[PDB]
Enzyme design. Sequence first.
Site, PDB file in Angstrom:
ATOM      1  N   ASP D 184     -81.624  28.863  69.632  1.00  0.00           N
ATOM      2  CA  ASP D 184     -80.859  27.624  69.712  1.00  0.00           C
ATOM      3  C   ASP D 184     -81.634  26.369  69.330  1.00  0.00           C
ATOM      4  OD1 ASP D 184     -77.844  27.191  71.295  1.00  0.00           O
ATOM      5  OD2 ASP D 184     -78.989  25.430  70.694  1.00  0.00           O
ATOM      6  N   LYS D 314     -68.670  20.785  54.750  1.00  0.00           N
ATOM      7  CA  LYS D 314     -68.808  20.039  55.990  1.00  0.00           C
ATOM      8  C   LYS D 314     -69.517  18.719  55.709  1.00  0.00           C
ATOM      9  CE  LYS D 314     -71.054  18.942  60.058  1.00  0.00           C
ATOM     10  NZ  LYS D 314     -72.380  18.315  60.322  1.00  0.00           N
TER      11      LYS D 314
END
Lengths: 129, 129, 445, 445, 445, 445
Positions: D184, D314
């Site tokens: 992460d 994006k």
Amino acid sequence: MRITQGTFSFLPELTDEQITKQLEYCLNQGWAVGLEYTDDPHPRNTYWEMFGLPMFDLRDAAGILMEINNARNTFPNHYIRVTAFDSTHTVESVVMSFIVNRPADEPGFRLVRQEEPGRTLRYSIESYA
Amino acid sequence: MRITQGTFSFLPELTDEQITKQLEYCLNQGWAVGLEYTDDPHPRNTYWEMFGLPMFDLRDAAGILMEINNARNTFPNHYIRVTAFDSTHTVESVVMSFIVNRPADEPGFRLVRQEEPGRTLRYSIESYA
Amino acid sequence: YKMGYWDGDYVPKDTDLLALFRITPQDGVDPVEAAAAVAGESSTATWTVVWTDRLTACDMYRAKAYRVDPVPNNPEQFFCYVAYDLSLFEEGSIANLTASIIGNVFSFKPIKAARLEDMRFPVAYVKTFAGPSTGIIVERERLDKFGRPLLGATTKPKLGLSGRNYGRVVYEGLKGGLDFMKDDENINSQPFMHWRDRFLFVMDAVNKASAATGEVKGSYLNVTAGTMEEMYRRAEFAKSLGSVIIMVDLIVGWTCIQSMSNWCRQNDMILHLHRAGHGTYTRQKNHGVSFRVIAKWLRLAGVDHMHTGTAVGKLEGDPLTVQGYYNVCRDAYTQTDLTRGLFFDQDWASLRKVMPVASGGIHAGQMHQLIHLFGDDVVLQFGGGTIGHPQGIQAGATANRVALEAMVLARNEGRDILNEGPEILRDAARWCGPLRAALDTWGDI
Amino acid sequence: YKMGYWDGDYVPKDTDLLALFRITPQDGVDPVEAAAAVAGESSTATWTVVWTDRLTACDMYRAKAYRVDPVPNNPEQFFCYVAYDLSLFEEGSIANLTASIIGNVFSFKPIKAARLEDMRFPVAYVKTFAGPSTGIIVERERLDKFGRPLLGATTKPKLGLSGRNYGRVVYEGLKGGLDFMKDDENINSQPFMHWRDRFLFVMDAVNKASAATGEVKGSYLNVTAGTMEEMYRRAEFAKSLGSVIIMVDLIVGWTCIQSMSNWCRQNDMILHLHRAGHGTYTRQKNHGVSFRVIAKWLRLAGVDHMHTGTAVGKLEGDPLTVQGYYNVCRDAYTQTDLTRGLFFDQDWASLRKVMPVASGGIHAGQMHQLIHLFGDDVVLQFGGGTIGHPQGIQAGATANRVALEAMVLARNEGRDILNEGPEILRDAARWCGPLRAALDTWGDI
Amino acid sequence: YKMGYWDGDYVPKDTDLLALFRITPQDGVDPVEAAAAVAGESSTATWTVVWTDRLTACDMYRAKAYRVDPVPNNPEQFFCYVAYDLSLFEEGSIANLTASIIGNVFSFKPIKAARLEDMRFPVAYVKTFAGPSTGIIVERERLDKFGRPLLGATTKPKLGLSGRNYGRVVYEGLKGGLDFMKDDENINSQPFMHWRDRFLFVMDAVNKASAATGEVKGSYLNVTAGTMEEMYRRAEFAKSLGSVIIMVDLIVGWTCIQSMSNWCRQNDMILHLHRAGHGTYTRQKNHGVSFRVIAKWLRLAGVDHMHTGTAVGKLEGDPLTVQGYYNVCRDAYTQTDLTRGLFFDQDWASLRKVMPVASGGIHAGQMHQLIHLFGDDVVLQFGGGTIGHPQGIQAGATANRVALEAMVLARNEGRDILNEGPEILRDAARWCGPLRAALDTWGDI
Amino acid sequence: YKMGYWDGDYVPKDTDLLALFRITPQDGVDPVEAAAAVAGESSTATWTVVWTDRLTACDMYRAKAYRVDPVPNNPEQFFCYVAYDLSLFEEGSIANLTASIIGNVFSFKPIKAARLEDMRFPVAYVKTFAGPSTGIIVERERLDKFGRPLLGATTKPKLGLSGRNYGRVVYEGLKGGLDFMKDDENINSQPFMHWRDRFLFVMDAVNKASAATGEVKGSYLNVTAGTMEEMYRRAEFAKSLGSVIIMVDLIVGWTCIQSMSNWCRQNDMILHLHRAGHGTYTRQKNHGVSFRVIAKWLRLAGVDHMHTGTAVGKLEGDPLTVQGYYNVCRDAYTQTDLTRGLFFDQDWASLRKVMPVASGGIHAGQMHQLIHLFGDDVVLQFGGGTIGHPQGIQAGATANRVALEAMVLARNEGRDILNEGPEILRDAARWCGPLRAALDTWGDI
């Protein structure tokens, strides 16, 4: 400026009367007494010059005191000291200075500072003689 | 040839009038002022000899200035300096020289060059006294 | 975003990280949602909802955005305050700090521009860093230089000189009164002069200078290199030669600096940081990271000297703002000061103070201004003004040195450094030939 | 400045460094003098004249500014081309490269804004760097994955999970078809889960996944840390557990990356670079450094995976410009292309190619677009789209995997990836339950 | 218990460990069973019977309790003697020694209180330890200081001083006649002054002092740290600077001390042990471990200086008992002496003698008492009396030094140290200004 | 003393160390002055005034005594609260912590008795320690053992067995259901069985056991030794053989433990601490140091298992007080609880939790009591009850295991563990032959 390389060296110079008392103390304890001298009073200059062999079984403090004065005469401009050895493990028990060089030229030995890596210094204490 | 080991040492010698002004500055900041002296101005010879204890709460720059001159008299052929300590973390805040040895014998200290392995040198800066 | 990343009445805990951004959202985007998006684009968040975080629960492990204020004299720009929980950051790791805080907020399109203005580090966090490897107090005690800013110049010849000649430039400068000499702006070890040779000669110069002045001398031997192995290799050689100080370039990276800082502490070295390249993000007041933050990080990292700014004396930045930077370096406890750009109170938990370095187009003439703006704890880095002195470098050195010495004495006497400055300098120049020439060439400006 | 830093008709030598800036001088400053000032504020120059450089002679050891062109659709902004001689840079040192080029040009006030748009590296210089520690070709051969972009996701739970549960998230993802799993965004080794424990479990997952799919699997074990000692410590542990890949954060610094790259080569590891924090300078097109340059440097440094951009899919950047970045990573010889922001022809002298990593708000629905814009050599990093899948991570994985597989087959058959994309995806979703659900949730956009 | 842990007429072998406890059983518990329980709660025993020990057979591998005597002037308290076979202890391991002997006897409820009063170590066992790393005889020969107790003080400023100022405190003291200087009671390396910096300055002071007095000087550089790695790190730095002595805090642990002792021997260092924290168990004469035992262990461990006690001169302990401690340190063969708390004859098998350190509220005035109670082999550690001297530290030093010198001379002449003490001191003070002032301030008590 | 060491209305800062003593001053001594004396006998203080501290200034660098309360049901005894500034302690150093706090207060005569009851560690300070090297959560995940206390026994034969036979004792125990086996109380490596040989056999047993039960097994291989070199030597061998856990004796010292803890973390080992010898100071409630404090320190040090107490089940200590100890080990945030002896609120700043170990005269019969008093996170160390089982060790193991299994199931169902305990055990014993025999032998008590 004064070499404090000895017992009693923080007191005024011992008188032959005081010295004899100490000599007796040693002899009473059965310690071999020796006389030494040098012009180089470097902190930890072990092995000063021997002024005659240690007065082992000399049952007379006066006899030793004699040699002391004799030494002072032969070597006035020298440091002289009495050392007491304990004949059981052979170690020094007492050591006091008597004659000191003429107003100790410079007891503020020259401190040498060799610049090592970092901020570390490699010192060398050396008498001016 | 001149030891630049101090604030203001690149200016002409301070006058008692100038010194007092500085002393005031320190005292105004509440700094303990001390006087020190040595014959060995080695770059980084911390621990000069103390000339009396630091004038802590001496509300009179003149009093300190007195001791200064007194010192110069006792030790003419010596380097003397005023140091100011900050009583909060205990650090030096100002240090300037006053009396300097007779025409600084040789500020071009002898630079010793010990030849280490390679082309490396192990230096030793040493005053000529 | 926003759903749980904004809390209007959230009171920051003393054990929280506080980041203050200058968010400039896109025309048509809510600043509040933007603030919340900031909190999301640098933690346990994403654009959509994820089920795996159900176990996680996060909450505390989330950056909570609280304050959102309008920017004075400039709408469409807003100050966003975000709070990060202490347990989100790795101990003593600036790389992780920067990573977590910045995240990808600067590349998030809904925000036209974003800038990190300031941060607050809880004492509990500050304590995980060793801080500077030496610090002002300790440094001065190694130098025997107190109550006066330090003097420094730069070996200007650069690429076009040999070690012998280069070292000379250093000898002249230091002997003339300079306390330090800096390796030229970009010379690490190019194909002409090998770093070793340069180090040998420079150290010979430094030593030769010490023995001619009777004080501690040094030269920021640039140790910057392509890999940590080279960098340590040069640091070790510098150490072996007996250098009191070393120099590293900011570009090397947060992690390299931390390693170098650790090294210096364990090897008794002063770590001089050259902020080369910072301008890429510390220039535009609308996007990037304010140098004051970079300065805080660098202090935590353990740097000993840090280029902070000339402040008005030359083209660099605003005086007060520069003082903010200087404060970050020398404060025991930095107090909030909106005028100097200080948005948070920062307790430095006894971390040693960093020595600021004033660099830029400066010269003896500005002395009085500098002394007034910075004081004693600063390294006055004179470049062209010293080297380009008409009577050589040594002369330039003596000029700046005297200018400094006098200015301090005068300042100590109480004289108005500012107004009387020019006169004080003239009085000194009167008996100081080199200073006279220095003023004649680089006078008022 | 200017006196000898500008040469209108100077022809750059094949052994010269070329830097192209976007100088925005102050209102009232000559662009030419500005260009010359750039050349001066990053080399053997200063504001005033110095006598010590007389010996130096410099000349060749000077940055000669040549081209100065007006900027299309935007006056007051100008493209300045500077030439630096090869002998001015240290071999294989990006830190020195950056140092020399950037100098202090970005903080020079006479320039309101300045941005580094592109650079040219002579083959002679490129050859001083080892380049990537693995490269696309070699990587694929270690993976046995050819003719298709790679699949990757992120262990989203982040801080709030234990090693056991975290490793599971990895197992599910990889088994479902993901080729890689990423630690992460900001978890290095915070006070809750120790990096070692995480590495143990993650590697157990990776192995368990390999034995269930029959293909090579991996997880970008984040090795980013505060000092090189920790970083190497984690790299070594990662290696010991048998990980095919490692991950480092850009923030660590150019020098740390170079050391890590060297390490990986000598330890047979793939070095994944996470560009966290770049936005601070790669966002504003008027000040900073264009990512394409950062990308060139990173390739020289030796990175194996590099986050390049989603491109239109994006909020990140312009498609063509992103392709410029992708080109910098995969070109054997980058040809000048002003539309893609490529200002110089760059010969990569046989340096291994870098694997771009497309990251951002993407999902299976955009597959056809991505495949068309990037092709086979790219790592499609799906975040929320995979983890947040209704039927779990494994399902999200299978969705993206199938979406990819099919899209490639179709593309190979010749079908118009773009136009037919939606249909092709529908055809696949028809028999692929998870894909169906993936499209129903994250459809067209 | 008891069944086989008590033997009324058991004769201890010369190859047995003897532990003498002061058992205070609960009201209603048989002292004999208690003694037997002691033997059981520190060996191959348990509350119930176990079959696995059938193979074991134990017998010899059991602690046999023998003597159980009533305590003079205090019933309900009893002296229990236990014998442990030599083969039960690991060679040269105080940690194992302590472990085996103590066991869990002090936490066994049936005993209200229990205290270890003394122990006997067989020559065979004593021989497994190297003993002190230097010893009195050798130390004196390194110091060239014979026939007089040694002088020592403490750098009182503590946390609130910088290395420069701290080292000065050391220089003044040593030059004034002190043979040693001690780092302040609790300063290891706190957030203000780094141990390295302190070591540099202190060693500069020590050297400067040696060159001004003409004798060997030293300072107990505290090397105490949180881990063995730091401790060795500081030990090595101390060594590199050339320090003749080092200091460690008891709290570090038996195992750490043994490692440090081994280190000192192999590096020619004197190991000064600071008994900080001992009071937690060496205070109450009814529970704990008597310091004389701790002293025996420490000698076996290899400590060179050991804080033993002021004895009457200040609030610490009983004169005779203190002499028991002093005996444990300086005896070649410790003879049983119930008055001095010595319960067993201890042959030290030629292990070097430890230098006792008299610390507490002492001053020149008590000289005569000290000299009489301890003699020549003791380090007189004067704190406030020296540092707080009206005319500075150097003066305090000279005072104590002279007071010592004279007292010895007089004592050697035969004069009654005790009765004539005050006079002898007055005679010295007469010509010794500093001593005069010392007596005027800290006179009789 | 007192002059500046007492401040009645001093409010402790969140960045302060708080020590709560139980001062028992001498008959005729003021408790207040005593408290102030405590503050003085552990910092920058002395009996007399010193001039050198003038520079120091101290103030903050002084322990300020504040609260002084009467002791309930016992006059002449008083609770004294002292506050120490954070900057007075070295980071991550328990040795320095203990040193500074304790000082020489326990040997200061004006105090008849003194005991350290509790302490408060600021988050800022707690964060300087790494805490446990594994912790409960992580440990269970390595063991795959959740929701139940762990089972452990001891290889009782001790000195009188050979490695082969010893390892067998271990195999039998573990296979029978024990989760862990402990090396006998005092066997390190005595002259009969060499630690290496024992380790080889024990590890063979542990492995053999794992393959017969299908779960992770282990044995606390005692690594305790005389020097750090041996200790690490045995730790490394233990590691090489693949042991999941290691054991160290408290007596080794705070510094050794810290080194061992650091080692374990970096080698993935569980560190079991055997509190042998603590009773010397943790027994008498009037002098010494309360175990709860020792427990806090041990947690900061990084221990993974810690002997806490049986609590009522056997002669050790008071239930609530024992729970205080258990809380210190397992609390995320310890809340003040005067009944359990907890005087301060302690925030453990996310430091991993320590596994308590219940040891003493316990057996299956007490199961219900234990489960109720401690819960799941505790290692039930059964000695004689297991080994001395009529049908061998394996049987004893199965007995305790079943007794545990059932008791948990029942407890989970809601059944009153306490009251129904005996019945639940009888129900289990009914079908569990070994349990039946276990209860018949060691029934109610």
